[PDB]
Design an enzyme around this catalytic site. Structure first.
Site, PDB file in Angstrom:
ATOM      1  N   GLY A 145       0.793  -1.231   0.000  1.00 17.01           N
ATOM      2  CA  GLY A 145       0.000   0.000   0.000  1.00 17.01           C
ATOM      3  C   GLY A 145       0.823   1.276   0.000  1.00 17.01           C
ATOM      4  O   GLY A 145       2.049   1.239   0.109  1.00 17.01           O
ATOM      5  N   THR A 146       0.134   2.411  -0.112  1.00 13.32           N
ATOM      6  CA  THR A 146       0.792   3.720  -0.159  1.00 13.32           C
ATOM      7  C   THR A 146       1.297   4.100   1.231  1.00 13.32           C
ATOM      8  O   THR A 146       0.883   3.513   2.231  1.00 13.32           O
ATOM      9  CB  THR A 146      -0.142   4.835  -0.683  1.00 13.32           C
ATOM     10  N   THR A 147       2.189   5.083   1.289  1.00  9.18           N
ATOM     11  CA  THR A 147       2.809   5.473   2.553  1.00  9.18           C
ATOM     12  C   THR A 147       1.876   6.363   3.376  1.00  9.18           C
ATOM     13  O   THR A 147       1.239   7.272   2.844  1.00  9.18           O
ATOM     14  CB  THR A 147       4.151   6.202   2.331  1.00  9.18           C
ATOM     15  N   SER A 157      -2.617   2.075   5.697  1.00  9.36           N
ATOM     16  CA  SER A 157      -2.030   1.633   4.436  1.00  9.36           C
ATOM     17  C   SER A 157      -2.390   0.174   4.195  1.00  9.36           C
ATOM     18  O   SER A 157      -2.419  -0.622   5.133  1.00  9.36           O
ATOM     19  CB  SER A 157      -0.509   1.776   4.479  1.00  9.36           C
TER      20      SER A 157
END
Ligand code: CL
Ligand code: MG
Lengths: 195, 240, 235, 250, 243, 244, 111, 241, 231
Positions: free
Chosen positions: E29-31, E74
């Site tokens: 996932g994204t930060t 995330s």
């Protein structure tokens, strides 16, 4: 409601049941048959609350007929009466109890004896030589206490029964429009058409 | 509650549990139904690897559902009792609400519906039973014979057989039963039924059961000697 | 084993796809829609000659204005029909009117995906639902165990379906009379059936605005079979 | 969520064995030896107290348990399984008997209830069988003294004397040579200690041995006086000191 | 083997492989980050702009629980929303019975027990998110990070997602360089910088920055989103540092 | 989920057999033999205890023969624990019937219901079947003396003489040989003991490895008595027929 | 003891012509001897050229109108935007009312 | 081999899921120790905070179950907290139902019973934790009772748990061989804490700062944990002797 | 492979294959396009038939007077989800006298789809949805995926060959966003968008399905001769 009577003699059980159905100030019917055949040698007459009576009678009829088909056998009058008593004994503590009083006339083919059972809506069972439900007994019992012999014939029983209907037709407030009379013996159940 | 879908489709479009239930029927003792001009006769095989049996008390192969309808079966005996009980209860329930006994078609439709339900309900296996249901509709003299199977399909038959070696006896019935002229009497119908079982059975001793249903709740089961007379008569005509 | 409601890698439900194979094994059923009515016809296909064919019931009434034909595991159809009849009658009770054919079909199709780990498996039967209502007139629907239904001018289902459907593609036009449709169902059934078509192993039916849903007698169908054979010989 | 295991985890194999029951009995075989001997005027049940660590206080872990004032239990196999069975056994003696008849159940019937609980763990959904064999000793007015063995299957058998667990085969043979129908309770305690020494390896004293009797009524252990009919528990756990007294005249 | 096919099964190591597999979904996932400050907490997250067709500012990822707690996560976004919905139910029932708004440690255990419960049975799947959350209560500021196993601790700074290691390194510098404490307005700026620095590990698609904060002095102890002038100021601070 | 560990106890084999029922019958074939013989004036129940130990308490023991009511008893072959579950249900069922109709339950009705319970475990619920076969011995005023058997499938049948458990094939052949219809109880006692003595897997049949019971009308006038034999009585009846 | 019913007064009137129909009602709303509102409408356009009023206990009246309006909405959703005829509306309203037969809507309804 | 995935018996009568839950116990790589004084019960555990970004005050494996009962856990924190919340709820309910404070040994039995259920019921996994309960019971005095994933429990004179538990165990055994008594013959809890840390240092062979340890103390009518400075005060006292 | 038997199982790389297989059903579905300006929002859908004798499967469903969606994938699943939206829109109106925000509609669908991806026995929904609406914050377009992921966009497309329309709309972004107060032009842009996803087939009169909602326009669907204007 009304007059249901029963007499057990030497060889048969005789049931007499009034023909009237009254609602309010109107006699709606004068030929009502207040009885159901539970098995070939077992007849039940009934009386009590409108609707409840027939609904209970037919429910018992269905159960005994179911038993008959399952076992290929006819329950004894004693066994049927105990089943009926238990159903009423259950009912009396239900949310809405069956308000139905019954007489069960049967001929036990294993014992070769007639048997009459009186059961009220509470589930109070007794075996009797003669029985009645409601106000009917207040009249007929003294008459039967006098004239009844345990060795009477079916014909003697019918004459004894005529005496009861006559007393009821004399002293009872209501017109119950006569009775339908049925005999239970070794040969099964039959109706007397001219009473 | 146990939920598992036991009856499911396979890649080729078959429901194997239903099809394996049919194999249980194929293992069961042979049962045959033949309807005449004024009667239906139900014949049943009883295997003879069981001597020392008590035939008074042993469950009979043909069961009365009501006084006018009978049910025989092929397959698992224990399974059949559940179907018979349910059928008997529905028979009394129908009399109670409709004030008329069940038609043979209706009773068959009910039994078949129960069987179908056990093919797409979770946590149950299908009935390992096929039935022959025979009788007469109330106030009707036209004979009725129906067949049901585990899948739930049902249909009417002029004559039919189920159980082990049923394909052999069906073959016999297919050439020996004339649609234009069904067995005109009780004797003719019982004989054709006994003949068909004798193609498969063994000895005509205590191996064959015969039950005759006639109109207006007239059902009776034949005794050994009565059946043995049909067996004796058929064999003497055969030696020709 | 594996879940009953599992997707394949191609994005299809295994059990639904497998039930479609069961339907391909079923007996042929054909429906044709005209402006004079909708005709429904089926192949009875008795497994043995001793079986009384008139007890084979693969065309069924749902209401006076809606009829139904089936193909596949026909035992599975009983509860579908029971639901359809109750849905039709219930709507009449609640709204004092006839229920639309499309609404009926949608109601039946709502049962379809109610399986999993609800019933244990999908239905193994496809339905042809034919009827009339005041809004959209004469209609024919094909109801599948996927829960999907298409309206059709004409449609065949069962073992002889892909061959029969190709034939229906050529024969159907928007001006077909009811009589023309009756003969066309018989003709195409006779083509795809195994045994030779007659009044005992095939059944016709129709739904018209005026007379409602009617299953034809074996006598009436026999004459249409005779009329069909004579017309094919006549050129 | 929710228990999706509504199906049996014990099933019949093609040979007819119930695998999980067999494997449960195997767990009982690995368990420490326990035994029971029936005398004319009492019953003795005994076992070794296998300590898990010398820092552990083995008095806080009781292998011999009172079920009713006249019934006691000991086991071989899995301790935790035994502990919860004792909880359930004590409760069922009340719910299904004492709360109905105003008296404690006879030994055979309490045993029957424990056996039921163990049978159900063999058939019900999403559970394994209990990994223990029980020995239940007790007394009641109309049956006198009795001794029962209950197995993981739910089967139970009455015994004059027996042993279960690690060295049960040898211990049973030892008991056959020594047991007669005229044994007095003290003679049975003596034989119990002799039999147990064979299966015990390390220390053999009142701190490593757990032993209880079903014998005479103990009015001093009742906790109250004034009711003539209440005369005290017949179950008594022998103290560490009482065991050592008998180990000298061994 | 097969020990990894079913949730709640111990491997011979004593591990639950299904939870470890959920962790892989989180790492994908994204930060997202969390910075604890003088009198509150700051949350920030990377929003990958997949296409021109995404409406800017209109796919909000940070979520509020009650009026004083912020949550960001995330991994599987829907799983995070499920956890926040539960968090909101837990916070509502706490406030219902006890009147006072739920304390942050109390709230942390509510999520923890719920996520832990999804490692107890094979009939459920573990959560595919690591959640950074916190706020201000009667005892001051608290920042937490919760993982698929149900494990959570209090944090000075927290980071999860594809650029977690980059963000962690940047967080550790702030903790070392500011032993006395970081201010709320400073922490907002730093959050922007760290997200931009952590974006290097996801630099194909360009991104959209989203920040929120709870501070006793700056937001009166309530959760608010950083918008307009304060957001653009924080973006500019971050842009200056990468060059 | 849990699908992985489901044995599917209530499914058909490709041949149309119920796996678990078949395997339960295989289990029962290793249990001690039990024999029932129906005579004109009574019924005999005889059963062999499973390999006994000398320290087993023999008198206060019950393993094979159980009383259902005053008129009906059963011989057990299989898992005893499973049998007791079913026996208690049967005992209750008998009392329900007596409470309802004020008459002792007909033997077949009790047998059918117990067999129906077994059937259920083979069609639904995903549980293992009961690993038990019963021999029912009883009396009622409709059919008089009756013998039945039921097995894990829930299928039941009536018999003049029957065996369950181990060596039924050999036992049935021996019973089929020496049984005749006009037989008396004391003759049936002898046949039962003789058959076990020849089919036993033990060296010699002794009193301590047997359970024995009779159901006679040998009370006083028109009533039935159940006699579960004591150890000494089995010792005597074994000497009286000259087996020991 | 709590009494779940009240009386909000007012009166309504419906007349039908050859190609039209009117449904009238006063706009007064009351409890006991007090006026709650001089203009509180109780005649409503329910869509599909159906006007409805449920007069008596206003809480029940509003609840019923609300449920019927919602019934019209779902009739469209379930039957391809078909117009709900006045006779079909009438039958539907019967079931709405009889569904609370043992705890009735205390209103006289006219459409 | 699905007998290794759920809690059913293996052919040799073993429960592998229970055995593997025991191995999860050491996943944190932390050692704990418990001893009894005359008036008190002291429990100590290692505190390892590897990440600099962690708030060290929130990292704990010692729990205050009730006013009188404390519990230290060996195992992963999610399972540890699961056990703690249940223990707290159980202790609270006991007090409400029975009118007196739940004894340490009774809570231990109850939690052991719950653990036993997970070893018998299939849908529930065992918790990968070992729970050490401590108190000064009003009847039994200073008490240490310990629970494991098998559902086993017993009282202890003293105990240790963790990867290097055996070294600590024998160290304690050898002391009690020497002293000839069941406890630490000391008046104040401060010196019993000092004994605990001293013997942990000897057994593990490591030195501890104030942030490397975690201490819980049970006295009559209260259990409490020590602050970093309380431990530092205790560390100074050991060093100056 | 070994990890795709049910939705409750993660793969070793942290994937949910059952959810991915559900996503695959959308890709097989017929193309549908969504786009909006500041005043209106438009759905365009290519309908699919079984053959020349069959009807064309309807792709667009009305949820409220101000909201509705288009579908691609399993149609029965779209019926379940649209029915849920109809109820949620309705609850908001009856209880709060409030038109359900298109954004909340998205959140509700996300959470309903999610629950089917974490429990045993269930399955993911096998359909993708494009929701358009006009509420108190103007026009909106949402994209629903059965993974649970809901996304707000100016324009988009889902189904087979949706990439063509999605690229076109990405180019046309600056033009069509400013088609304010002109319905027919916004539709023309959507019809041109869906044309970039056609192969061998062209838009006919019983093939094209258009829906529009906006400032002074209730959610209405156009089929048959009403779309002839746009071919
Ligand atoms: Cl407990
Ligand atoms: Mg478990």
């Amino acid at each position: 409601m009304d007059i249901i009577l029963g007499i057990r003699v030497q060889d048969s059980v005789i049931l007499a049941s009034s023909k009237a159905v009254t609602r309010g100030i109107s006699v709606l019917k004068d030929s009502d048959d207040k009885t159901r055949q539970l098995s070939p040698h077992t007849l039940m007459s009934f009386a009590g609350e409108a609707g409840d009576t027939v609904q209970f009678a037919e429910y018992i009829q269905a159960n005994i007929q179911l038993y008959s088909i399952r076992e290929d056998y006819e329950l004894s009058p004693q066994a049927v009466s105990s089943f009926v008593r238990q159903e009423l004994a259950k009912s009396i503590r239900s949310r809405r109890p069956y308000q139905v009083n019954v007489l069960i006339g049967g001929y036990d083919k294993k014992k070769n004896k007639p048997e009459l059972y009186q059961i009220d809506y509470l589930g109070t069972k007794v075996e009797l030589p003669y029985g009645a439900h409601g106000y009917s007994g207040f009249y007929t019992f003294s008459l039967l206490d006098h004239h009844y012999r345990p060795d009477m014939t079916t014909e003697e029983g019918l004459d004894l029964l005529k005496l009861c209907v006559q007393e009821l037709e004399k002293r009872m407030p209501m017109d119950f429009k006569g009775v339908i009379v049925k005999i239970v013996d070794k040969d099964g159940i039959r109706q007397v058409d001219d009473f | 509650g146990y939920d598992r879908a036991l009856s499911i489709f396979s890649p080729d479009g078959h429901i194997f549990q239903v099809e394996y239930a049919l194999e249980a029927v194929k293992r069961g003792t042979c049962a045959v139904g033949v309807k005449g001009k004024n009667c239906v006769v139900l014949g049943c095989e009883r295997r003879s690897t069981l001597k020392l049996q008590d035939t008074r008390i042993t469950p009979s192969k043909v069961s009365k559902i009501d006084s006018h309808v009978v049910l025989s079966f092929s397959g698992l005996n224990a399974d059949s009792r559940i179907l018979i009980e349910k059928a008997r209860v529905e028979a009394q329930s129908h009399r109670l609400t409709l004030e008329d006994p069940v038609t043979v078609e209706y009773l068959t439709r009910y039994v078949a519906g129960v069987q179908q339900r056990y093919t797409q309900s979770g946590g149950v296996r299908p009935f390992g039973v096929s039935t022959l249901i025979a009788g007469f509709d109330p106030r009707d003299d036209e004979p009725k014979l129906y067949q049901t199977e585990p899948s739930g399909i049902y249909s009417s038959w002029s004559a039919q057989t189920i159980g082990r070696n049923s394909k052999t006896v069906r073959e016999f019935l297919e050439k020996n039963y004339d649609r234009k002229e069904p067995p005109a009497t009780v004797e003719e119908c019982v004989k054709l039924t006994v003949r068909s079982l004798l193609e498969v059975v063994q000895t005509g001793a205590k191996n064959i059961e015969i039950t005759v249903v006639k109109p207006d709740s007239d059902i009776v089961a034949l005794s050994s000697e009565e059946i043995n007379q049909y067996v004796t008569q058929i064999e003497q005509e055969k030696q020709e | 084993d594996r879940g009953v409601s599992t997707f394949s890698p191609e994005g299809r439900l295994f059990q639904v796809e497998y039930s479609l194979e069961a339907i391909k094994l079923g007996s042929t059923a054909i429906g044709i829609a005209t402006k004079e009515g909708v005709v429904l016809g089926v192949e009875k296909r008795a497994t043995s000659p001793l079986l009384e064919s008139d007890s084979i019931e693969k065309i069924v009434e749902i209401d006076r204005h809606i009829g139904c034909a089936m193909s596949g595991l026909t035992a599975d159809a009983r509860s579908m029909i029971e639901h359809a009849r109750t849905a039709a009658v219930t709507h009449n009770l609640y709204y004092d009117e006839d229920i639309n054919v499309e609404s009926l079909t949608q109601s039946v199709c709502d049962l379809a995906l109610r399986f999993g780990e609800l019933m244990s498996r999908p239905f193994g039967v496809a339905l042809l639902i034919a009827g009339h209502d005041a809004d959209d007139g004469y209609q024919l629907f094909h109801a599948e165990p996927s829960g999907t239904f298409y309206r059709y001018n004409a449609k065949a289902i069962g073992s002889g379906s892909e061959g029969a459907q190709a034939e229906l593609l050529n024969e159907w036009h928007s001006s077909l009379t009811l009589k023309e449709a009756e003969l066309l169902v018989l003709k195409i059934l006779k083509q795809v059936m195994e045994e030779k078509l007659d009044e005992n192993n095939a059944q016709l039916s129709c739904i018209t605005k005026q007379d409602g849903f009617k299953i034809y007698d074996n006598e009436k169908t026999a004459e249409l079979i005779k009329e069909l054979k004579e017309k094919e010989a006549a050129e | 969520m929710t228990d999706r295991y509504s199906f049996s985890l014990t099933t019949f194999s093609p040979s007819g064995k119930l695998g999980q029951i067999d494997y449960a009995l195997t767990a009982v075989k690995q368990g420490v030896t326990s035994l029971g001997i029936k005398a004319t005027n009492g019953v003795v049940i005994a076992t070794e107290k296998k300590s898990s660590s010398p820092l552990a206080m083995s008095e806080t872990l009781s292998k011999v348990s009172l079920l009713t004032p006249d019934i006691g239990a000991v086991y071989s196999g899995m301790g935790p399984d035994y502990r919860v069975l004792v909880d359930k056994s004590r409760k069922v003696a009340h719910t299904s008997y004492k709360r109905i008849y105003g008296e404690y159940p006879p030994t055979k019937l309490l045993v029957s209830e424990v056996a039921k609980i163990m049978q159900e763990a063999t058939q019900s959904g999403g559970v394994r069988p209990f990994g223990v064999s029980l020995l239940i000793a007790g007394h009641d007015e109309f049956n006198g003294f009795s001794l029962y063995q209950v197995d993981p299957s739910g089967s139970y058998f009455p015994w004059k004397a027996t042993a279960i667990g690690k060295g049960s085969v040898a211990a049973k043979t030892f008991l056959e040579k020594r047991w007669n129908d005229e044994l007095e309770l003290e003679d049975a305690i003596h034989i119990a200690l002799l039999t147990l020494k064979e299966s015990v390896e390390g220390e053999f004293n009142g701190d490593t041995i757990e032993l209880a009797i079903i014998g005479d009524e103990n009015p001093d252990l009742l906790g109250y006086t004034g009711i003539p009919t209440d005369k005290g528990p017949r179950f008594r756990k022998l103290t560490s000191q009482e065991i050592n007294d008998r180990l000298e005249a061994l | 083997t097969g020990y990894d096919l079913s949730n709640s099964v111990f491997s011979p190591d004593g591990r639950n492989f299904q939870v470890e597999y959920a962790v892989k979904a989180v790492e994908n996932g994204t930060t997202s980050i969390g910075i604890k400050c003088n009198d509150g907490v700051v949350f920030a997250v990377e929003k990958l702009i997949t296409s021109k067709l995404l409406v800017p500012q209109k796919n909000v990822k940070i979520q509020v629980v009650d009026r004083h707690i912020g949550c960001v996560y995330s991994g599987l976004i829907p799983d995070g929303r499920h956890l926040v919905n539960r968090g909101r139910e837990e916070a509502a029932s706490f406030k219902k019975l006890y009147k006072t708004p739920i304390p942050i440690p109390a709230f942390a255990d509510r999520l923890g027990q719920y996520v832990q419960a999804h490692t107890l049975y094979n009939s459920v799947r573990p959560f595919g998110v690591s959640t950074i959350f916190g706020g201000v209560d009667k005892n001051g500021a608290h920042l937490y990070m919760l993982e698929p196993s149900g494990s959570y601790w209090g944090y000075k700074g927290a980071a999860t997602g594809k650029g977690r290691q980059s963000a962690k390194a940047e967080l550790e510098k702030l903790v070392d360089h500011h032993p006395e404490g970081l201010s709320a307005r400073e922490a907002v700026k730093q959050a922007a910088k760290i997200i931009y620095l952590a974006h290097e590990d996801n630099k194909e698609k360009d991104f959209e920055l989203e920040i929120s904060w709870c501070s006793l002095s700056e937001t009166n102890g309530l959760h608010k989103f950083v918008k307009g002038d304060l957001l653009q100021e924080a973006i500019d601070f971050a842009q200056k540092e990468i060059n | 989920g849990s699908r992985r560990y489901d044995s599917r106890t209530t499914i058909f084999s490709p041949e149309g057999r119920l796996y678990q029922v078949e395997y339960a019958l295989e289990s029962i074939s290793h249990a001690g033999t039990a024999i029932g013989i129906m005579a004109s004036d009574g019924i005999v129940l005889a059963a062999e205890r499973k390999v006994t130990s000398t320290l087993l308490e023999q008198d206060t023991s019950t393993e094979k023969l159980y009383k259902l009511n005053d008129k009906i008893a059963v011989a057990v072959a299989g898992l005893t624990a499973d049998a007791e579950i079913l026996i208690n249900t049967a005992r209750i069922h008998a009392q329900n019937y007596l409470k309802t109709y004020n008459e002792d339950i007909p033997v077949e009705i009790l047998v059918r219901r117990l067999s129906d319970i077994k059937q259920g475990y083979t069609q639904h619920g995903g549980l293992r079947p009961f690993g038990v076969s019963f021999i029912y011995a009883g009396y009622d005023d409709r059919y008089g003396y009756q013998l039945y058997t039921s097995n894990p499938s829930g299928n039941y049948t009536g018999w003049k003489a029957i065996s369950v458990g181990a060596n039924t094939s050999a036992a049935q052949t021996l019973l089929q040989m020496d049984y005749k219809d006009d037989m008396k109880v004391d003759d049936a006692i002898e046949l039962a003991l003789k058959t076990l003595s020849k089919t036993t897997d033990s060296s010699a049949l002794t009193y301590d490895r047997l359970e024995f019971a009779t159901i006679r009308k040998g009370a006083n006038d028109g009533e039935v008595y159940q006699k579960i034999f004591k150890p000494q009585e089995i010792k005597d009846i074994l000497v009286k027929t000259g087996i020991t | 003891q709590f009494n779940p019913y009240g009386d909000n007064g007012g009166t309504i009137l419906g007349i039908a012509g050859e190609d039209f129909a009117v449904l009238a009602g006063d706009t007064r709303n009351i409890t006991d001897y007090s006026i709650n509102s001089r203009y509180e409408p109780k005649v409503f356009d329910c869509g599909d050229n159906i006007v409805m009023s449920a007069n008596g206990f206003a809480a029940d009246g509003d609840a019923l109108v609300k449920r019927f309006k919602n019934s019209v909405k779902w009739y469209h959703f379930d039957h391809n935007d078909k117009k709900l005829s006045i006779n079909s509306a009438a039958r539907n309203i019967q079931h709405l009312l009889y569904g609370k037969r043992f705890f009735p809507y205390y209103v006289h309804t006219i459409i | 081999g699905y007998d290794r995935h759920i809690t059913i018996f293996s052919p040799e009568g073993r429960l592998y899921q229970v055995e593997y839950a025991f191995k999860a116990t050491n996943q944190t790589n932390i050692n704990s120790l418990a001893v009894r004084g005359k008036d008190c019960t002291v429990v100590i555990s290692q505190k390892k905070v590897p990440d600099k970004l962690l708030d060290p005050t929130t990292v704990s494996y010692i729990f205050c179950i009730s006013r009188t009962i404390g519990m230290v856990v060996n195992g992963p924190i999610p399972d540890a907290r699961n056990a703690a919340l249940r223990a707290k709820a159980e202790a609270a309910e006991f007090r409400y139902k029975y009118g007196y404070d739940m004894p340490c040994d009774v809570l231990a039995k109850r939690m052991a019973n719950l653990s036993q259920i997970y070893t018998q019921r299939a849908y529930m996994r065992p918790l990968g934790v070992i729970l050490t309960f401590v108190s000064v019971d009003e009847e039994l005095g200073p008490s240490i009772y310990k629970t494991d994933p098998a559902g086993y429990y017993v009282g202890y004179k003293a105990t240790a748990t963790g990867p290097k538990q055996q070294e600590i165990t024998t160290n304690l055994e050898n002391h009690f061989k020497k002293s000839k008594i069941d406890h630490i013959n000391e008046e104040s809890w401060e010196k019993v804490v000092e004994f605990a840390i001293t013997h942990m240092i000897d057994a593990l062979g490591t030195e501890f700062s104030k942030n490397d340890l975690e201490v819980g103390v049970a006295t009559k009518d209260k259990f409490f944990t020590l602050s970093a400075e309380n431990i530092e005060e205790r560390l100074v006292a050991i060093a100056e002797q | 492979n070994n990890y795709d038997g049910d939705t409750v199982t993660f793969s070793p790389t942290g994937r949910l294959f059952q959810v991915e297989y559900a996503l695959e059903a959308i890709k097989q579905g017929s193309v549908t396009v969504g786009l909006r300006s500041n005043t209106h929002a438009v759905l365009v859908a290519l309908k699919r038939n079984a053959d020349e004798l069959s009807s064309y499967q309807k792709k667009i469903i009305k949820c409220d007077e101000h909201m509705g969606l288009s579908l691609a994938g399993l149609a029965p699943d779209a019926r379940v989800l649209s029915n849920y939206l109809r109820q949620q829109c309705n609850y908001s109106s009856l209880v709060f006298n409030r038109k359900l925000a298109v954004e909340r509609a998205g959140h509700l669908l996300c959470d309903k789809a999610q629950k089917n991806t974490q429990s045993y026995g269930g399955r993911p929904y096998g359909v993708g949805l494009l929701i358009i609406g006009y509420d108190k914050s103007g026009a909106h377009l949402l994209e629903f995926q059965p993974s649970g992921n809901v996304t707000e966009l100016y324009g988009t497309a889902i189904g087979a060959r949706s990439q063509g329309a999605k690229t076109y709309l990405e180019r046309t972004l600056d033009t069509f966003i400013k088609i304010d107060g002109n319905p027919d032009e916004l539709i023309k842009a959507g019809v041109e968008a869906i044309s970039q996803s056609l192969r061998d087939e062209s838009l006919t009169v019983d093939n094209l399905s258009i829906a529009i909602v906006g400032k002074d326009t209730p959610f209405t669907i156009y089929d048959g001769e009403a779309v002839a204007k746009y071919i």
